[PDB]
Amino acid sequence: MKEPEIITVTLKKQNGMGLSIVAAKGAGQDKLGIYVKSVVKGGAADVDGRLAAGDQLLSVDGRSLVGLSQERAAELMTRTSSVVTLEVAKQGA
Numbered sequence: 001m002k003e004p005e006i007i008t009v010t011l012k013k014q015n016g017m018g019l020s021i022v023a024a025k026g027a028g029q030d031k032l033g034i035y036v037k038s039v040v041k042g043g044a045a046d047v048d049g050r051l052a053a054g055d056q057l058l059s060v061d062g063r064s065l066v067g068l069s070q071e072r073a074a075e076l077m078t079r080t081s082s083v084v085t086l087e088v089a090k091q092g093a
Contacts, residue, residue, distance in 0.1 A: 061084055
């Protein structure tokens with residue numbers, strides 16, 4: 001069985017979020033997680049070096065995006081305060 005690495009990271013907003021995301025399902029998960037399609041060079045997450053491309057997102061600022069659409073997650077990420085906590089999962093398919 002595949003065993004990824006999920007960790008909650010805390011980053012701030014410099015000029016939005018330069019990274020692609022997707023709301024789909026997978027294995028051992030009958031919901032829709034917010035996966036990271038890619039990260040635009042220059043973004044706070046890219047420059048820092050925490051999350052990577054082809055990852056999964058569960059919790060955001062204390063909340064949980066388990067079973068939400070790409071719009072709901074993306075819209076929620078933009079409607080956040082200065083600091084934004086995100087729990088990424090080290091995986092890939």
